Design a protein around this ligand. Structure first.
Ligand SMILES: C[C@H]1O[C@H](O[C@H]2[C@H](O)[C@@H](O)[C@@H](O[C@H]3[C@H](O)[C@@H](O)[C@@H](O)O[C@@H]3CO)O[C@@H]2CO)[C@H](O)[C@@H](O)[C@@H]1N[C@H]1C=C(CO)[C@@H](O)[C@H](O)[C@H]1O
Ligand SMILES: C[C@H]1O[C@H](O[C@H]2[C@H](O)[C@@H](O)[C@@H](O[C@H]3[C@H](O)[C@@H](O)[C@@H](O)O[C@@H]3CO)O[C@@H]2CO)[C@H](O)[C@@H](O)[C@@H]1N[C@H]1C=C(CO)[C@@H](O)[C@H](O)[C@H]1O
Lengths: 664, 665
């Protein structure tokens, strides 16, 4: 009713939406649509108009003033200029005097020119007038989003343990590597529930093996780790290594489960294991075959997975590789200097994630051959769907921890997202923050960034400020790239400081989980821009470095080096809370308005809204040990918090026992 | 100045950074601990509250704690927070806390500042060779310590007045049409401007000290076509002298042994824009004078300023590097077994650029003894600008020339300014350009700016405007853009009157800004100051990093977040919030000491006036020579006094009672 679906050409069915919406028949309600060059929507914006959405895209909460292209790209350098990151989330809302939401249900490259060309002009275009546009209406932007959240289906719900802290590093390889990490944390009493395993745990980077030489009995090691409440979260890449004898490879080939070239042969793309093949994620059968392979690890005790390189990322195809070796040929023999080293360098770079490669292989969809570039942004989506759907067969009642890098809307039902290869820059603390709400609008609630920065060298302080933001993000893990400064918490001085920050995560767990469960089950938001909560405050709607969490709190982390505080705007009176390093909790009332607050490196800050309160537990070293019984209530006297909780393992969501009102 | 003990280690190369002879102190080192096991290392444990200023043009913020900085002039077009080395080497730092003192490491080689990077409480300055002078500057506070240092390094370079105008630039402008188009585009729209820069294209095949003969049949006249319009062309000069027979500059450098040379006596070859080039031996006096004198060519044609580029010096690849690369390309090409990953190929291409190894392959002839370049690496750009400067004074001693350089070392500030190089059209770079200001001032470099709009990548309308609004206050205010970037000339955007509004604020402030720069340079004082220097005992002010004091009257606080309509500020004393309005009016508002949010729209230029002060504001003019300083509105507080310095802005006659006049509100 307050949602209509306008249809152009013959759209590919993305299965993005779970709710049926009939094809409206009147005139498109806003702006203009054109077909002189492919397809274009053009809209003129009110000078005060704010644009939200685009989920995991570059820049800030208000998208006005730059260009975003949905075109899932493996790009390790997230600088302000980049137009396409990992995600393809074609949902925007124009909010102002004239407010409306738009979802562009489209598989391929979609360019959102949001004021970049002309300031007052919003122009969303793509090569093909074959798509569905969904127009949503409501009073405010929050209401437009909650409607969207309805029609795309309930977001993924992770197991309770995933609301713990997780340690990860590209490099962990042996039982020793892993033990010294468990050692490092448990011996210094720093809580943690997860350690991630990156590609070095496989045999020759073969999907669905383990290095038999390093884990002669992987299952027992898993049980040894799990005994200390450490759950090993293995990675899975998109490419299956080409290698005779390799079971997963032989099957893929024999049953035509792989993407093929225009000639029927299996397309080769090179990744970690060298030459690989990509499972045909768009083909229902291949998807059940791929998903089922997760049993290999589940049967061994594994309760979580992360999907990577699933744009899919291509270092080089056999086609590109020959072009390059060949060019290098003329370079090597160049006497006249007709071939500059810059160009040789340019070719090496162009064979990576080549657009030419993305038209070299095809998907087989219920018998229809479709070229990959045409459906490019669905690949990661469906790889994560394969896992999810396979999960539900293996054990319909159990929750598995699951996240992916690349995604498209609809994938939000089967798994969360991590924000990819960030760097150890202070600006990336803010980027982590700004992306949260957008992702929530698009259904992705279980998200977080690599704390302390994936790439490059971190410092003791960058890490602590990153963690302090992580405290509030459902996914909280410290991750680091190959050969960077070691950034485990125990790899610094005065380690107790890190204990302090993590401790705060582990006291806030029952609240954060609660607020998560309530949001997901209600097709609602976990993180909200201040604009959603105080739509009348023309000051609040412009704030981009503070977020509302649930209905009880606001967060505002420090993201500047050497700072000892930061400016905040409070659209209402709140109590200002800091989790102190001695184990106590500072509390101060602060009137609405502007304020500079003092927040030391080893203190964690949050605000509690007027007439509200939240439960806080004692610090425990793992999710299982948190005493949920006698929690302290912080906030406003006479207020009440409805606390959700369940076994945090199965999907028994609708019990009256799951709710329990607390009054301060 | 015997409040500046100097400590000697080894047999230091003389950088000529100081103009003041300081004797070699004789006691143990006044602070921390010195070690000499595997080179040289100063190690100091800092107090928790200590702040660290300095390092001029270096990465990150005002307070330098919490990272690692390396003096090693490097051509790096990507200015991300992780970078440890950019273009300049300004080895001056100051520890500001319970124990305040200042340090200058006079060392021309790779010098590492580990400022609380490894251990948070640990400052460690180390290098390979113990061949260095270390100046310890004692004093009451940081500001004072900086004033001392400014005096032993000598008066800062002083630009002609026309350089406080606005300038337009692009790695693209090639023909008369292009330049005329910039002319017409600005003039027709009554947008103030004084300079148009000429990038490497005006040359004859990138040959230094030539001009394109087909492009510019009669250059002196075209230069005149522009000058009559109050537009001054500022051509670039590159470090590399193109290798080519018949090319006079090359023939002479070779004939007279003026180029840097391989170990074996051969003229070292480095590839740059022109192709193979030689580098003029900037550490050789005869060479330095020969190169400097070459500027006459352009000066005798009516040119009144220059910029020196690529002078780290930047190297695309050496002859040795190309060969090594082509031979690797071969192995890769014929490799049938996948022995050679494409990543290794790609890594080799990257390796040949600015290859530390090349910097080991050429020497400087310093009156007799040959010195391997890497041993004096941070000096190259400094002595190239020194070549140009000394030349100017031989060529015409009365007249001031516009001069600035990319690479630099303390001491170069006497001969020219610098721009902050290849930044990017990122909002974060507006702040980066802000934060570098104070630091560069502490090291003598006052004439500085950044590429407004962002050099690299594509800018937007709002980004360019917020950049200009900072640029209003930086002595170098220049719009420059990379090859193939979106056009960022002010006339290439809708509602052009918002660019005329903003750049009006500049020309209206020019009388006062010029005044402060002149006063500051002649007094060995700073033009920009961190708030700590002015409000030493306000714990809140000593940590403000995104505001700056300018002279002794005003404070700046640029908007740097995209889509923001205001920003938070902290005021250490009562002040008049002022906005140059898009209508021409100047809004005024008193705000007390404390935190505030102030509305600054895109097309408004903000600034604050200190309690007890005021400033002159002229009416808008479209070029510097047309500005009317006779009757200027005074903006500020009642019964305050401003001393206006002014002169002909052309010659070098600075010490005269007639240059000053007291204005009273
Ligand atoms: C691990 C990471 O590797 C791949 O990306 C890397 C590039 O291939 C490298 O060339 C290198 O690029 C840097 C260059 O040296 C230089 O141009 C500099 O300016 O910066 C560049 C980027 O920092 O570094 C890249 C990233 O470190 C691949 O594209 C990327 O997606 C990979 N990340 C995934 C893989 C692993 C291992 O399974 C996980 O640890 C990550 O979390 C994944 O997201
Ligand atoms: C003009 C500029 O060119 C040289 O640097 C360029 C590189 O050679 C290119 O490879 C390219 O780098 C980009 C990467 O491919 C990409 O990874 C992305 O991250 O951005 C990189 C840089 O934006 O672009 C570079 C910049 O164009 C040279 O080393 C550099 O120092 C040059 N700058 C000076 C030269 C000119 C022309 O005479 C002047 O206009 C400038 O103002 C100078 O500062």
């Amino acid at each position: 009713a307050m949602i209509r679906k306008y249809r152009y050409g013959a759209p590919f069915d993305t299965e993005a939406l779970t709710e049926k919406i009939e094809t409206a028949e009147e005139a498109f309600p806003y702006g203009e649509i054109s077909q002189k060059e492919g397809f274009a929507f053009t809209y003129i914006m009110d000078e005060d108009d704010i644009v939200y959405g685009l989920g995991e895209s570059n820049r800030g909460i208000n998208k006005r003033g730059y260009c975003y292209i949905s075109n899932c790209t493996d790009d390790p350098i997230h600088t302000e200029d980049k137009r396409s990151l990992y995600g393809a989330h074609n949902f925007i809302i124009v909010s102002g005097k004239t407010t409306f939401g738009l979802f562009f249900d489209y598989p391929s490259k979609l360019t959102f020119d949001i004021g970049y060309t002309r300031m007052d002009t919003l122009k969303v275009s793509c090569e093909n007038a074959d798509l569905d546009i969904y127009v949503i209406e409501g009073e405010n932007a929050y209401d437009i989003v909650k409607q969207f959240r309805r029609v795309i289906g309930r977001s993924y719900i992770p197991p309770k343990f995933a609301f713990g802290f997780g340690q990860s590093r590209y490099g962990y390889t042996t039982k020793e590597d892993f033990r010294a990490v468990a050692k490092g944390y448990r011996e210094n009493h720093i809580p943690i529930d997860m350690i991630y395993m990156d590609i070095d745990y496989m045999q020759d980077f073969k999907d669905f093996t383990v290095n038999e030489k390093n884990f002669p009995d992987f299952p027992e090691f898993v049980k040894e780790m799990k005994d200390q409440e450490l759950r090993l979260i293995p990675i899975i890449d998109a490419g299956v290594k080409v290698e005779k004898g390799y079971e997963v490879y032989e099957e893929g080939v024999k049953n035509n489960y792989f993407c093929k070239r225009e000639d029927g042969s299996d397309f080769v793309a090179a990744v970690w294991p060298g030459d690989t093949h990509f499972p045909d994620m768009l083909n229902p059968e291949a998807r059940k075959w791929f998903g089922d392979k997760y049993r290999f690890l589940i049967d061994q005790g594994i309760e979580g997975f992360w999907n990577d390189m699933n744009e899919p990322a291509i270092f080089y195809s056999s086609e590109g590789l020959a072009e390059a070796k060949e060019f290098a040929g003329e370079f090597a023999k160049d006497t006249e200097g007709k071939i500059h080293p810059w160009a040789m360098q340019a070719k090496m770079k162009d064979i990576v994630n080549s657009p030419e490669d993305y038209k070299r292989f095809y998907h087989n969809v219920n018998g229809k051959k479709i070229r990959h570039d045409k459906v490019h942004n669905l690949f990661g989506y469906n790889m994560t769907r394969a896992a999810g759907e396979a999960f539900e067969r293996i054990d319909p009642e159990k929750r598995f921890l699951m996240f992916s890098r690349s995604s498209y809307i609809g994938m939000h039902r089967y798994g969360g997202i991590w924000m990819g290869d960030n760097k150890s820059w202070w600006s990336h603390i803010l980027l982590n923050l700004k992306m949260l709400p957008s992702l929530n609008m698009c259904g992705f609630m279980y998200t977080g960034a690599d704390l302390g920065g994936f790439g490059d060298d971190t410092t003791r302080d960058l890490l602590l400020r990153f963690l302090a933001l992580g405290v509030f993000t459902p996914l909280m893990r410290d991750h680091a790239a190959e050969g960077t400064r070691e950034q485990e918490c125990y790899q610094f001085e005065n380690i107790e400081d890190f204990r302090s920050v993590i401790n705060a995560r582990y006291r806030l767990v029952p609240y954060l989980y609660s607020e998560y469960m309530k949001a997901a089950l209600n097709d609602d938001m976990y993180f909200k821009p201040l604009g959603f909560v105080y739509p009348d405050d023309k000051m609040a709607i412009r704030v981009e470095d503070q977020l509302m969490l649930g209905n009880e709190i606001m967060i505002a982390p420090v993201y500047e080096q050497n700072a000892r505080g930061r400016y905040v705007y409070l659209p209402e009176e709140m109590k200002f809370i800091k989790f102190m390093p001695d184990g106590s909790i500072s509390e101060e009332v602060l009137e609405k308005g502007v304020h500079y607050v003092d927040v030391a490196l080893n203190e964690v800050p949050l605000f509690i809204r007027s007439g509200k309160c939240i439960p806080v537990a004692e610090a425990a070293e793992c999710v299982k040990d948190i005493d949920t019984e006698n929690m302290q209530l912080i906030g406003y006297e006479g207020s009440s918090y409805t606390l959700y909780e369940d076994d945090g393992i199965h999907k028994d969501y609708d019990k009256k026992e799951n709710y329990r009102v607390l009054t301060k």
